[PDB]
From a paper:
As a xenobiotic sensor, PXR is activated by structurally diverse compounds and plays a major role in drug metabolism and drug-drug interactions by regulating transcription of genes encoding drug metabolizing enzymes, drug conjugating enzymes, and drug transporters. Here, we report structurally related PXR-selective agonists and antagonists and their corresponding co-crystal structures to describe mechanisms of antagonism and selectivity.
L428V was chosen because (1) it is potently activated by the three ligands, (2) it is a conservative mutation in which the WT residue (Leu) is biochemically similar to the mutated residue (Val), and (3) L428 shifts away from SRC-1 in the antagonist-bound WT PXR LBD structures. The mutation did not alter the overall protein fold, including the position of α12, as compared to WT PXR LBD. Accordingly, the M425-V428-F429 contact surface was slightly compacted compared to the M425-L428-F429 surface. The residues M425, L428, and F429 form a hydrophobic “hot spot” that contacts agonists through moieties such as the 4-methoxy group, and mutations may change the nature of the hot spot due to a combination of factors, including hydrophobicity, orientation, and size.
Author numbering:
A (entry chain A): 142 to 178, 195 to 230, 233 to 310, 316 to 432, 445 to 459
B (entry chain B): 142 to 176, 199 to 310, 317 to 431, 445 to 461
Write the structure that this text describes.
């Protein structure tokens, strides 16, 4: 099997996930919704928003259903940004709480904790979003909220191909939370000082995930599952880089980022430029 | 053809309709949206889904809830009250610009508008009704009948009236006939209103003979007048059901309360103010 230290490592990550992942989105409230009613910069922004166009569905407690179809391309392209801003911030807060519960993360310097959270916030959210993704319907089922993709041409978008590829691997709850740990403890994040320590921590999470697949799955059929998982994490880091650059382009012509997102994406001393992230980590 | 008085009559009614019917509902804003046994049958009869199209091209759609423990039956009721009040305000302005209605006593103006508010509103709602889709296309707003439904008299009324394929002039004459009803409760000048009603009916009969020679339009004037009698029956039924819902759950706006009864100018203060304001 696995070393008891490896079994305890999974225990802490799973415990962190249970305490910090609102799988039913029950506590996601008070979010903004779309209301009822330089050229090269905008030209790039329109292509950034057209790729991920979704319809919104709100199921009520009484049984009624509200549905929102997105408009066609104008400034209407930023109709869902405040809602997505609230959803990202809500998810980022749960990721921050996830890292705080992990003991290996708490023992790191505060400047390294901010650097790791800044580089892995988007990735750990996509990893959590994949657990509520329905590939048959192309819908992220977030409790009462649902995000369905409007439209082969989808698989061209890397973030859509990522969710379909990751969902097809059919990972366990432990394998997902190990991907989060591996992604969180990335030593090559910008601003990280303790490179050697974070690299050794990442290797331990990777070894445990590699050992978990060997011990808990049929040996010949899942012979390369661990390597497929690492390839998805590499692709997710490429998508994280591309998403950050899109967001900074959208933010440039049309500010929409919340104060917490501004700290994560570098929008205007790590501790003095990331005071919200610093305060959330000190609580 | 038509006498010059009849031609001026249709001209004033059509000009009245154009100035007071917001067919696109573009000036309908600030309205509410969704967040005993016999009363539950009243609301189940008219179950509709709401669609709100935005200027940008987006669509908000609301599918209604299913009956399960009550209270949820009155989700769209707040909105239907805001839509009704907006429609009646245009109905009030419609009557206010007709010369024959201005020259009546203000106590009779309240009485006539109190008895024909629902009828004139349904006649206007029928003009934006799509029988093939079962939807009232109210500009950016759309009200689709959520899926033998003709058992409801108000729904059969809209389908039967749409089949007659009436012109704009025939609709606005029906509004005049319904508005100048002498037997409305509270009307004092019975003979003045009854004489006014007969002139509108004669003009409608004359218009039909001068402009509809086809065999499908045979007995059209008598079918129209029969539809107006049916609409008066539906008006009483709707008033009875509304008061039951208001009894167990008050939902009528202050203007609706005046019309449905929930010294005429003393109880009808807003109606009194609107009739005195300029059009």
């Amino acid at each position: 099997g696995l070393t008891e230290e490896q079994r305890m490592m999974i225990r802490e990550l799973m415990d962190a996930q249970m305490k910090t992942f609102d799988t039913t989105f029950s506590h996601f409230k008070n979010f903004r919704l779309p209301g009822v009613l330089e050229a090269a910069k905008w030209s790039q922004v329109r292509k950034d928003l057209c790729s991920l166009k979704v319809s919104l569905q709100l199921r009520g407690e009484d049984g009624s259903v509200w549905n929102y179809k997105p408009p066609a391309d104008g400034k209407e392209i930023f109709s869902l940004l405040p809602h997505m801003a609230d959803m990202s911030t809500y998810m980022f807060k749960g990721i921050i709480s996830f890292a705080k519960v992990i003991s290996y993360f708490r023992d790191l310097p505060i400047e390294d904790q901010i650097s790791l959270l800044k580089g892995a916030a988007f990735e750990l959210c996509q990893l959590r979003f994949n657990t509520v993704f329905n590939a048959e319907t192309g819908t992220w089922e977030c409790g009462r909220l649902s995000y369905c993709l409007e439209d082969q041409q989808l698989l061209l978008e890397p973030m859509l191909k990522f969710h379909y590829m990751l969902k097809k691997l059919q990972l366990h709850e432990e394998e997902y939370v190990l991907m989060q740990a591996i992604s969180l403890f990335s030593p090559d994040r910008p601003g990280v000082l303790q490179h050697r320590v974070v690299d050794q921590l990442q290797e331990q999470f990777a070894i445990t995930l590699k050992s978990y697949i060997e011990c808990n799955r049929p040996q010949p059929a899942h012979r390369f599952l661990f390597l497929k998982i690492m390839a998805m994490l590499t692709e997710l880091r490429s998508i994280n880089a591309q998403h950050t650059q899109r967001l900074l382009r959208i933010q440039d012509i049309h500010p929409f980022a919340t104060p917490l997102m501004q700290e994560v994406f570098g929008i205007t001393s790590l501790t003095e430029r990331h005071k919200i992230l610093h305060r959330l980590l000190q609580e």
